[PDB]
Amino acid sequence: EVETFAFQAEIAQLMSLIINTFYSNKEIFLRELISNSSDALDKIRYESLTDPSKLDSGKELHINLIPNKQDRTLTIVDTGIGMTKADLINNLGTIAKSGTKAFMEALQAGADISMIGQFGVGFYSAYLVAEKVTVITKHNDDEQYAWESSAGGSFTVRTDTGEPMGRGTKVILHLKEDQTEYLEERRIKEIVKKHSQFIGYPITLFVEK
Ligand SMILES: Nc1ccccc1OC1CCOCC1
Fold first, then answer.
1. What residues contact 85, with CB distance under 8 A and at least 6 apart?
2. Which domains does the chain have, with CATH numbers?
């Protein structure tokens, strides 16, 4: 059972700008997703300070980067707070309507796409490199759900029957044909060292057979 939703007009416009603007510095997508994961880990850590049972769904707080050349996917896994179904539908827990408004005013006033994270909509920078994005998520207060969009103005949400996650979020980037450099170990390490050196959680880059 799959529910199909229309993006709010402003979010559709944000995604088409990201997809269509000529902009070579695409590697910042990874910094934005890692920073989102760090924010989600901060949230569950703060909740656990006063309620240790919040970590019954998993005590480890970390970020994994899993490239898969056979599937042409890069997956960013975190064990953060996760998102409820309502969160997913409401622009993946972001204030994306007002953030898009500010971002596009900034762009016409000198800014570039790399500053997207300052406006709270850094998730959508995934579409700099991915033709499709799947988000699998589990929050302590809800069931496991899968969000998916190939842009084009709509997204789907369904209950996830895949491998149970415990708690957290998985962002699966189905990469564009000409963006497979982001599956190469040396390129991913370079980007993590350049842009994510002060993230306060272990970031593990998986290797492939
Ligand atoms: N981790 C994550 C993955 C994909 C989209 C958003 C994400 O973070 C949001 C905002 C911070 O924490 C709550 C959920």
1. 142, 143, 145, 157
2. 2-177 (3.30.565.10)
